[PDB]
Amino acid sequence: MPKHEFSVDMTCGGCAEAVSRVLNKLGGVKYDIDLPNKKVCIESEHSMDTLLATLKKTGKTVSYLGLE
Ligand SMILES: [Ag+]
Ligand SMILES: [Ag+]
């Protein structure tokens, strides 16, 4: 199953919480948040568009670091 890696402008724990809330409301996702490195790793059959649009709902700078 595709593992997408994203960069999110998370400055503290409450940003990581904001990230989980939006990703939870999305559903169909297993996810991993690395706060010190400002990274979010997402196991999902969801398209990159959807994941990107979802993460951007937080109001924060989001970019795509790619896949594996
Ligand atoms: Ag924060
Ligand atoms: Ag915050």
From Swiss-Prot:
Phosphoserine (modified residue): where?
S47
Per UniProt, where does Cu cation bind? C12, C15
One example of the protein's molecular function in GO is: cuprous ion binding
Effect caused by changing C15A: Impairs Cu(+)-bridged heterodimer formation with ATP7A
Disulfide bridge partners, by residue number: none
Q: Which residues carry this modification: N6-acetyllysine?
A: K60
Q: Where are the transmembrane segments?
A: none
| Tissue-wise expression | Ubiquitous.
* Ranges for domain HMA: 1-63
What changing R21E does, per the record, is:
Has no overall effect on Cu(+)-bridged heterodimer formation with ATP7A
Tell me the Gene Ontology biological-process terms attached to this UniProt entry.
Answer: copper ion export; copper ion transport; intracellular copper ion homeostasis; negative regulation of apoptotic process; response to oxidative stress
Q: Name one GO cellular component term.
A: cytosol
Q: Which family does it belong to?
A: Belongs to the ATX1 family.
User: Subunit arrangement?
Assistant: Homodimer. Interacts with ATP7B. Interacts with ATP7A. Interacts (via dimer form) with SLC31A1 (via C-terminal domain); this interaction improves ATOX1 stability and controls intracellular Cu(I) levels.
In the record's own words, the domains note is: The heavy-metal-associated domain (HMA) coordinates a Cu(+) ion via the cysteine residues within the CXXC motif. The transfer of Cu(+) ion from ATOX1 to ATP7A involves the formation of a three-coordinate Cu(+)-bridged heterodimer where the metal is shared between the two metal binding sites of ATOX1 and ATP7A. The Cu(+) ion appears to switch between two coordination modes, forming two links with one protein and one with the other. Cisplatin, a chemotherapeutic drug, can bind the CXXC motif and hinder the release of Cu(+) ion.
Q: What is this protein called?
A: Copper transport protein ATOX1
Q: Which organism is it from?
A: Homo sapiens (Human)
The record's gene field reads ATOX1
